[PDB]
Amino acid sequence: GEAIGYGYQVKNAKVDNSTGKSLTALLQLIRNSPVYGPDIQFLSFTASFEEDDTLRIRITDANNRRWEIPNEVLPRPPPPPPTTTVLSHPHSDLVFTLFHTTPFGFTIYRKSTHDVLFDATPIPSNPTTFLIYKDQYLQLSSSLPAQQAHLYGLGEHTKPTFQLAHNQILTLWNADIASFNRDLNLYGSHPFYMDVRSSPMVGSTHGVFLLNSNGMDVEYTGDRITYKVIGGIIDLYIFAGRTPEMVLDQYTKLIGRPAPMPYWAFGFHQCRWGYRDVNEIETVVDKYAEARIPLEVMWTDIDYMDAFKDFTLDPVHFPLDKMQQFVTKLHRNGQRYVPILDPGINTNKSYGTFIRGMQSNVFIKRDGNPYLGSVWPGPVYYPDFLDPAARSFWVDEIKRFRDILPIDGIWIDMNEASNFITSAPTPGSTLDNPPYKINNSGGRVPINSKTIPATAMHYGNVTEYNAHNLYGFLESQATREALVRTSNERPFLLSRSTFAGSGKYTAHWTGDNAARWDDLQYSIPTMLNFGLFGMPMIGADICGFAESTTEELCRRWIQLGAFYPFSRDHSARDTTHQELYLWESVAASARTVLGLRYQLLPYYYTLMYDANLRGIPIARPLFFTFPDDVATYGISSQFLIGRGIMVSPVLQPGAVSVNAYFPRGNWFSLFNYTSSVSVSAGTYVSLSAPPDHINVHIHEGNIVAMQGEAMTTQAARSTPFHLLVVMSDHVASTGELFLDNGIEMDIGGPGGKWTLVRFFAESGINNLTISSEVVNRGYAMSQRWVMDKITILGLKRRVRIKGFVVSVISDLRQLVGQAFKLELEFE
Ligand SMILES: C[C@H]1O[C@H](O[C@H]2[C@H](O)[C@@H](O)[C@@H](O[C@H]3[C@H](O)[C@@H](O)[C@@H](O[C@H]4[C@H](O)[C@@H](O)[C@@H](O[C@H]5[C@H](O)[C@@H](O)[C@@H](O[C@H]6[C@H](O)[C@@H](O)[C@@H](O[C@H]7[C@H](O)[C@@H](O)[C@@H](O)O[C@@H]7CO)O[C@@H]6CO)O[C@@H]5CO)O[C@@H]4CO)O[C@@H]3CO)O[C@@H]2CO)[C@H](O)[C@@H](O)[C@@H]1N[C@H]1C=C(CO)[C@@H](O)[C@H](O)[C@H]1O
Ligand SMILES: *[C@@H]1O[C@H](CO)[C@@H](O[C@@H]2O[C@H](CO)[C@@H](O)[C@H](O)[C@H]2NC(C)=O)[C@H](O[C@@H]2O[C@@H](C)[C@@H](O)[C@@H](O)[C@@H]2O)[C@H]1NC(C)=O
Ligand SMILES: *[C@@H]1O[C@H](CO)[C@@H](O[C@@H]2O[C@H](CO)[C@@H](O)[C@H](O)[C@H]2NC(C)=O)[C@H](O)[C@H]1NC(C)=O
Ligand SMILES: *[C@@H]1O[C@H](CO)[C@@H](O)[C@H](O)[C@H]1NC(C)=O
Numbered sequence: 061g062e063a064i065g066y067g068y069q070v071k072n073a074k075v076d077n078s079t080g081k082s083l084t085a086l087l088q089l090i091r092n093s094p095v096y097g098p099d100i101q102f103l104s105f106t107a108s109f110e111e112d113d114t115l116r117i118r119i120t121d122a123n124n125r126r127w128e129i130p131n132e133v134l135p136r137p138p139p140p141p142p143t144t145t146v147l148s149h150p151h152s153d154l155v156f157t158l159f160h161t162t163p164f165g166f167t168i169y170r171k172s173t174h175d176v177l178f179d180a181t182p183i184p185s186n187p188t189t190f191l192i193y194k195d196q197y198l199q200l201s202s203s204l205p206a207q208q209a210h211l212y213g214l215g216e217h218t219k220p221t222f223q224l225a226h227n228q229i230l231t232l233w234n235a236d237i238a239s240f241n242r243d244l245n246l247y248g249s250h251p252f253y254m255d256v257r258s259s260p261m262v263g264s265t266h267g268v269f270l271l272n273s274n275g276m277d278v279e280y281t282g283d284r285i286t287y288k289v290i291g292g293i294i295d296l297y298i299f300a301g302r303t304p305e306m307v308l309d310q311y312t313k314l315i316g317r318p319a320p321m322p323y324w325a326f327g328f329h330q331c332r333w334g335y336r337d338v339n340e341i342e343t344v345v346d347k348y349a350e351a352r353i354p355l356e357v358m359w360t361d362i363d364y365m366d367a368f369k370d371f372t373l374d375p376v377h378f379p380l381d382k383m384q385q386f387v388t389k390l391h392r393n394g395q396r397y398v399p400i401l402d403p404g405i406n407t408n409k410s411y412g413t414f415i416r417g418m419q420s421n422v423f424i425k426r427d428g429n430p431y432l433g434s435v436w437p438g439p440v441y442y443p444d445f446l447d448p449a450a451r452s453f454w455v456d457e458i459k460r461f462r463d464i465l466p467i468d469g470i471w472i473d474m475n476e477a478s479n480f481i482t483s484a485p486t487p488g489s490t491l492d493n494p495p496y497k498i499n500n501s502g503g504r505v506p507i508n509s510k511t512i513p514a515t516a517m518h519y520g521n522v523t524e525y526n527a528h529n530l531y532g533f534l535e536s537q538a539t540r541e542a543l544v545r546t547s548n549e550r551p552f553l554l555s556r557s558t559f560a561g562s563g564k565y566t567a568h569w570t571g572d573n574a575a576r577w578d579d580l581q582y583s584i585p586t587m588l589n590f591g592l593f594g595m596p597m598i599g600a601d602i603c604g605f606a607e608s609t610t611e612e613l614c615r616r617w618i619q620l621g622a623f624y625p626f627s628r629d630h631s632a633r634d635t636t637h638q639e640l641y642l643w644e645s646v647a648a649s650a651r652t653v654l655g656l657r658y659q660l661l662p663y664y665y666t667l668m669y670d671a672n673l674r675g676i677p678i679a680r681p682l683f684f685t686f687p688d689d690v691a692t693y694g695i696s697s698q699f700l701i702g703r704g705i706m707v708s709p710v711l712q713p714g715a716v717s718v719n720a721y722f723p724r725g726n727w728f729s730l731f732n733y734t735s736s737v738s739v740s741a742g743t744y745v746s747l748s749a750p751p752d753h754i755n756v757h758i759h760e761g762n763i764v765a766m767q768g769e770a771m772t773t774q775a776a777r778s779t780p781f782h783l784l785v786v787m788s789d790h791v792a793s794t795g796e797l798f799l800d801n802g803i804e805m806d807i808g809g810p811g812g813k814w815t816l817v818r819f820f821a822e823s824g825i826n827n828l829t830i831s832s833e834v835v836n837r838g839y840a841m842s843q844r845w846v847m848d849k850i851t852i853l854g855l856k857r858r859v860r861i862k863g864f865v866v867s868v869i870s871d872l873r874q875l876v877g878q879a880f881k882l883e884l885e886f887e
Contacts, residue, residue: 065192065199066091067163067182068103073145082108082140083147085158086122096197097495103193107158107166108140110297112151113310115168119193119294127292127526129273133446133534134561136271136314153300163190168298173260178268178298179203188286193294197496200270200294201286208258210693211285212681214278215250215589216558218242218570220578222585222681222696224253226282231499233275234529234557236478236510239586240574240606244502247476247571248558249529250593251276253285254307256683256693263687267299267307269314273529273559275498275507290494290507291526304684305676312594312675316564319540320672321597322550323802324396325469325567325626326664327356327773328654331398334633335363337377338386344639345390351641354654354771357396359471359630364399368436369406371413371461380464387466394772396468398552403475403535404433404440413457417443422450424524426516427486433512434480442477442512445534446527447519451541458542469552472539472566475532476557479511486515491525532557536565549803554626558595567597567626575604575635580617581711585696587624591677596668598679599624601631608636611643612713612751618646619754620709622653623701625664625678649752656730656756658776659766660701662797666765667702669798672807682706685759686723691742695721704762704786705730708747708755718749726864727757728786728853733866760788760854763795763819765847765876777802780848781876785821785830787854792822799840799876815840815877821852828852828859828884840877847874850882859884 066089073085087103102122110116118139120126131138143160153172159165165181179202183189192199204211211224214232218239219225232249239246251270256263270276274291299310312318330348335341341358348355364383366372373380387397405417417423423430423441430441443450458470485492485506491514497504507528508514514525536555543551555566562568570586573579583600590598602621603614609631618640621627631638640650657664667678676684680700682692698708698720706727708720723742729735737745737757747755758764763786768779787793800807800814808814816835821828830850834840852859852867859867862885874880 062093062095064095064187065093065099065190065194066187067190067192069162070158070160070164073158073160075145075147076140080109081147081149082106083145083156083158084140085145087164090163097194097490100193100195106140107147107156109149109152109154110137111310111313112149113153113300113306114314115152115154115156115298117156117166117294117296117298119191127274128295129271129530133530134271134315153302154298170264173264175257175260175264177255177266189284196290196490196494198289198292198294199286200296201284203284204255204282206282210256210258211253211280212256213250213253213589213592215593216246216248217244218246218582219585220582220696221694222588223694224280226280228280229499230278230280231276232278232529233498233500233507234476234532234559235500236474236476237501238572238574238606239570239582240572240576240579245500247556248532248562248568249273250558250560251278252311252560252593254304254592256304256687258690258693261302262690263303263683265301265304265307265687267301267311269297269299269311269560271295271297271560274526275500275529277498288496288498290496290498304681304687305674308592308594308675308677312563315561315594317673317675318563318594318596318671319565320550320807321567321668322552323661323665323777324356324773325552325597326661328354329357329359329398329628330355330639331359331361331628331630332633332637333361333363333631335360338379338382342386345395347639347641349771351647352771353640353647353650354658355395356773357398357468358390359398359400359628361400362402362436369411369413370401371457373465383465391466394774397466398469398471398554399467400471400473401539402435402473403477403531404435404437404442406437407432407439407441416457417441417453420449420453422447422453424512424516424518426513431512431516433477435474435478444518445531445538446522451538454538455542455545458539459546462546469554470539470543471554472532472535473556475535475555477512477531482506482509483513485513489515491515491523529559533559533562533565536562540565544805548805550805550807560593563593563595568595569598569626569628570600572605573600574606575609575613576607577613577711577713579604580613580620581697583620583624584699587679588677588681588699591680594675596671596678597626599626599628602627602629603631603638605630606632606635609638611645614638614643615646615649615751616710618650619653620707622650622657623679623707623756627657645751652731652752653754655769658769658773660764661773661776662765662767662781663702666796666798669807670796678702682721682723689723689742691721692723704759705764706757706759708757710749710754716748716750717746718755719744719746720755723759725788726760726854730756730758733851733853736864758784758786758853760786761791761793762786763793763821765795765797765817765819773802780846782849782851783819783847785819785850785852787821787823787828787852792820795819797876799843799845812836813839817876823855826886828886829881830884831881832879834877834879837877837879841875845876847876848872858887860887
């Protein structure tokens with residue numbers, strides 16, 4: 061019947077003089093409790109400004125090192141070398157206070173508005189509000205203003221809303237659990253949240269990140285949020301914002317900037333678990349072409365392997381000679397090839413990969429011997445991606461395979477790690493039997509369920525208990541290295557399991573979703589979440605992975621999915637086929653929406669550049685552009701592509717309209733520029749949405765450079781640019797275009813083989829000026845890119861060279877690389 065804990069008192073505390081102030085304190089345990097294991101008696105507590113806009117609060121055992129995510133994995137600045145102690149800096153909005161109460165507390169508030177962002181003041185009678193710090197139970201709690209704080213993140217979980225619902229528990233423990241399941245912990249763990257405040261100073265946003273790889277539950281009740289973490293330390297970062305985009309800049313500066321993607325990765329991808337042989341995949345490619353549906357990349361799932369073994373080919377169904385011919389043909393036709401790899405290596409003694417893995421001792425061990433799992437080929441050992449020797453092995457196996465069969469990228473799956481068996485716990489081990497049970501799979505299921513046991517060991521005598529959540533991330537680092545060492549092109553990989561920082565290495569997809577209307581909608585919050593997580597190259601399996609799709613659902617899904625940053629149709633083997641050519645209405649919608657997507661390729665690519673620079677997501681919440689509009693905070697079924705393009709999908713069967721929120725102003729359909737929406741105060745509009753149409757609109761104030769439709773992205777890149785200029789009465793219009801060869805390793809780097817163009821448009825009382833400014837004109841000029849047309853929306857008078865109307869300036873024949881200034885007059 062003992063209390064869960066008694067908390068800590070401040071024994072000493074002081075702010076450093078003679079440098080950028082930081083605060084150091086020693087805390088002492090008030091009293092022990094047997095509940096949840098041994099209390100740490102003395103804690104070192106530091107608060108320090110890493111940058112003016114980032115505060116770090118680090119709480120460690122004063123007398124012993126504890127597990128921390130290694131710097132080599134996630135490189136970051138090192139730690140600093142009644143009564144209250146205050147830490148403030150003249151150039152920082154964040155003010156930190158240490159309260160010497162019993163038990164102690166701390167807060168962080170804004171110097172400017174006095175809004176308290178994180179409030180770890182305990183309620184003295186209530187231990188659920190204390191800092192508790194036991195070897196396998198860390199508890200950290202903050203109160204929140206229930207109506208004003210709007211929280212987002214804490215992945216990975218499927219939810220019907222993007223804004224986090226009040227009164228829930230979010231569990232972070234990477235697990236092979238299908239994303240068609242609401243609420244449960246899924247493949248990745250992202251202990252970050254964004255907190256957008258509706259007042260004071262509407263739209264004032266901050267971020268909170270707990271840099272910890274251990275299993276945890278995070279309980280959010282609206283007026284409080286509480287972390288319950290089963291190991292490691294508290295290493296808490298607060299990002300000042302104050303805009304949502306600034307918070308992601310600050311967060312990704314810490315965890316890593318989003319990796320760039322090659323231009324081709326924005327083309328359409330096709331995959332299926334169950335393609336039977338090389339003839340079938342060839343036929344799929346042929347049928348896409350016959351249907352005039354763009355197809356950029358053909359994928360092969362585990363079917364291609366010899367009995368589900370990595371780095372092999374089925375000699376009957378996917379023989380090497382035919383596969384070489386297939387890939388050669390793809391390449392001749394401007395297409396690309398991506399195969400799957402699983403992490404588990406089959407233990408067959410006559411399998412070369414196993415022999416080599418054994419020779420280099422690359423596998424995760426338990427009880428002194430390689431840990432034996434079960435996955436698709438049966439028995440497997442798992443490479444230890446924390447071990448440099450295993451990463452070298454992985455690089456070498458990929459090289460060996462690529463030397464025999466060319467590939468363009470890699471899909472890494474099952475990397476939680478997934479295990480089809482659960483091993484018995486080591487008797488007496490509190491790692492395999494932890495004192496606090498996190499809510500794994502929604503049933504307090506033991507952490508070792510269907511994975512590698514916590515007592516397994518990694519390089520450096522690191523336990524699986526501590527390193528589990530890093531496995532997919534580490535495999536992603538190793539796989540990207542393997543690709544970079546075997547091709548000088550910008551690489552492409554897709555990973556299932558992720559951790560904070562994975563976006564610096566890989567794309568992600570939402571995993572095993574289902575062919576259900578619910579999942580169609582769930583793809584939107586998950587897409588938005590992964591942007592916040594610094595993983596902008598995100599999408600869901602179009603038409604649904606599990607269960608058989610329907611014509612209507614698949615039609616609505618390609619309509620939406622054609623706007624995902626990562627756009628792939630994929631399916632399980634036991635379902636009907638769902639290639640887009642199979643139903644005419646799906647094929648016809650696909651041609652329409654992939655046509656617009658392909659016209660938008662230069663825009664997606666520019667946004668990818670922006671994401672790598674500043675962390676800003678490609679697919680972003682409405683509140684990134686309209687943070688002062690509280691109505692946008694709870695939107696979960698619409699999203700932006702870049703600043704000013706909004707996608708408003710139909711998400712229900714039988715619907716021929718959708719009630720869609722429009723922020724203030726004028727919005728123009730990208731499918732028919734004569735069709736527009738104009739609102740004053742933002743409100744809902746019941747948009748027409750017939751079976752063959754999805755609503756996609758561009759807001760006043762924006763300029764977007766398009767290219768033409770084509771069946772491949774390479775062909776698209778050789779077409780003329782058409783500039784879409786949407787005027788606003790209240791502000792000049794702007795836009796941006798980034799150009800390189802589509803595949804440079806270091807995007808926008810000092811080598812200079814790239815151009816950045818900025819566009820401007822402004823109305824005068826009797827004229828209109830449209831112009832560009834160009835950085836590095838040379839590259840763009842040498843690539844012959846032509847701007848041949850400008851379309852001007854948003855005015856009620858026509859314009860020409862010396863309700864709403866549409867003006868078109870044609871046959872310009874100008875070089876994109878040559879800065880221009882065009883003066884137009886009204887008619
Ligand atoms: C292709 C694909 O294949 C594989 O995935 C498949 C999978 O194999 C299929 O079986 C299927 O799985 C579905 C399943 O059908 C669904 O039902 C669902 O399951 C979830 C439940 O619906 C949900 O309720 C919950 O279940 C909870 C219970 O709620 C809860 O009651 C409790 O139940 C048990 C506990 O299990 C017991 O341990 C114990 O509980 C104890 C506890 O142990 C103690 O510690 C203590 O606390 O006391 C308690 C209480 O006594 O008893 C309880 C009572 O009975 O826990 C349950 C959880 O254990 O969660 C379920 C999910 O876990 O969803 C699943 C899927 O998650 O479909 C999937 C997907 O198709 C592979 O795994 C997958 O990776 C594969 N996909 C990849 C492969 C390829 C091929 O290369 C690619 O093409 C793909 O792209 C890849 O992604
Ligand atoms: C390890 O790989 C071996 C080579 O692929 C497997 O043996 C081969 O199994 C083929 C298909 O199952 C069979 O047609 C081949 O004749 C045979 N080749 C040789 C050289 O033995 C082996 O499979 C197991 O052992 C053989 C002898 C049979 O009893 C199979 O049914 C077994 O599955 C693989 N070992 C394991 C444990 O899978
Ligand atoms: C683009 O949208 C406009 C506006 O809805 C369409 O023009 C209307 O067409 C209907 C007949 O379908 C006429 O009754 C209206 O008078 C038209 N309105 C205007 C303002 O001209 C136009 O047809 C659409 N374009 C395409 C290619 O579908
Ligand atoms: C015409 O545009 C210029 C800038 O391009 C602006 O400064 C000027 O005021 C405008 N003149 C009229 C008459 O609209």
